Amino acid sequence: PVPSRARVYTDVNTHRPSEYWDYESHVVEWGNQDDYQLVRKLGRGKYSEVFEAINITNNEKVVVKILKPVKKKKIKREIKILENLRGGPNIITLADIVKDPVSRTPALVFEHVNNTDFKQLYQTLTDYDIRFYMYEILKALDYCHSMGIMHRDVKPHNVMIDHEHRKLRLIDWGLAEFYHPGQEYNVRVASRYFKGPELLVDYQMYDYSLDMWSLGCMLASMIFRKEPFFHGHDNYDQLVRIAKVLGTEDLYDYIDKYNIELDPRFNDILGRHSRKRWERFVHSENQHLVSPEALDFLDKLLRYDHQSRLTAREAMEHPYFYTV
Amino acid sequence: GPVPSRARVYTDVNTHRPSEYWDYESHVVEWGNQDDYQLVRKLGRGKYSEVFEAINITNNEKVVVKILKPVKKKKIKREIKILENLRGGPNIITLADIVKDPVSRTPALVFEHVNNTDFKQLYQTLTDYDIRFYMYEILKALDYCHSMGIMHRDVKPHNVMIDHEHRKLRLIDWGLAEFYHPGQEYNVRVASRYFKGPELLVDYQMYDYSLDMWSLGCMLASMIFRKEPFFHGHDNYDQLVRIAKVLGTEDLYDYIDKYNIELDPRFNDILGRHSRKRWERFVHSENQHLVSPEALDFLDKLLRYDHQSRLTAREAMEHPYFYTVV
């Protein structure tokens, strides 16, 4: 395959000392979990359980994420990334790294986030709300991208919102990675519905632009009230669902531009598909969230070619955000 | 008999944890194959151990290998359980593996690599800031292990490794460490002579984490006054006399009366009568650049006969002497 590099923040890690991006060499100091009392279970991941807790030393609520130790380098990577991004705009704030004296299970302690119900907001959300929160996610992305990191798991489950205080946090940095130009990354990241075409066609030299595809999948689901927007039933079928919207002509132009070899599993399922107009997805239920600006912005995110997608900084200057 | 005593901090941390945590005699040790490590050179010694620099052949990473002279089986079990309990704690030497050479079958412990700076010729370069910085780092290690219900019981310069280039410090040799249980009577034949607390010298067995804070105070006094060691005893009885020549004998009697301690008759002809000295008496041209009112107030609050009156590691961390550190 033809090599590729990010259009923005290409060399941000190249120009930094090894200690910043060398997570395997980073030394983790695990404090005593005795300072925290677990209150209740909040959420759950495939390799984590998230609890609400109280810090007994200051009577402040915190969030404790207990990690299922499956891979050691993976825990070190998330911690390093969290330490590098600690305090960044709309990034979940790592407050402590602790282990329970008896269990010795890795646990991460974060700033408390007061989650407003996802299904309660969904119908009462306005056109303004979507632009407001889209801009807040973009602040988090432009920032982590500038810090040489790609989240690689951008989805609604990984965005916590406290609608009362108009506060948003991008969470679960467990799949996050450091961007290095020319590096070949594992394509088994993100959650099926949010996987970029680069992942589905096994193109490893991807970059920050992967997060912009995932962001486009989120916006499409919100403005059209269609969740998920691209409803694949497996990773191969996922590309077919994308192809039913973007068409198969542009998919072949994409794979030819990067000299990508299409997996034979696609042979009997891909078919032939016309490129659809974004206006076809507008209906009575969703028309109050759709505008020419929203559709133009969406069109500029949901592109096969990872290089042709808007960067987080270009996205922030789009007319869709002129009112925020 | 003697009046009972208990720690002011972390008193019941082991009482409220299951058997599993502190019952080291019941802990099962999994000894891996030492074939993954090649010994490079001898770094140091211990009366019960030899410490080497080694290379892990599987990842080309340097490690530290401590080979234990099997004197007591429960003792190896205790050190391993404590190291596993503290594994990953701040400024604690990190146990990476537990191995046995296939032929020798000798217990060996594998740790994270620590790059020791030659403490020699660099004591003269050390600044007031460096002492405060490194003292704070040791306090992080102590508050953590005490919070985990462990007393180190051998705090001294030899057991603190410093990589000055990276400003990295590790508290090592947990071979004398013990689990703290309130009301437990411990063996007083612990620590190294110059660092032994008065509780050990007067054979007061119901001691606690505060023993480590006395040893820390001996280290601080030696560094700030450039007097190594600060309390230079020639035997364990003479050690108490050396302390008494500084702290005075009036406060020593108040200490032994508070705990109804019986003073050994061996002290009768050597203890004498000693006035309590001002810490300012130890300031000279060679060390005045390391001494300040804050340092002397902090030292005074560590070097107390009464183990209960000494600062805890958490109280020490909040002292004005540390207001200038990160």
Ligand SMILES: CCc1ccccc1-c1ccc(CNCCc2nc3c(OC)cccc3[nH]2)cc1Cl
């Ligand atoms: C107007 C915002 C928006 C714009 C476009 C697309 C989607 C949304 C959106 C819609 C809903 C949500 C809310 N997601 C909450 C997910 C969440 N993850 C959690 C969790 O993870 C461990 C634990 C406990 C609670 C948790 N809550 C987030 C977002 Cl970003």
Ligand SMILES: CCc1ccccc1-c1ccc(CNCCc2nc3c(OC)cccc3[nH]2)cc1Cl
């Ligand atoms: C005088 C005490 C003091 C007071 C305040 C601040 C610093 C010091 C100090 C000053 C120097 C050192 C250096 N200690 C070296 C310890 C060491 N232990 C080793 C070892 O043990 C087996 C093997 C090989 C090398 C080893 N090096 C440690 C310390 Cl803690």
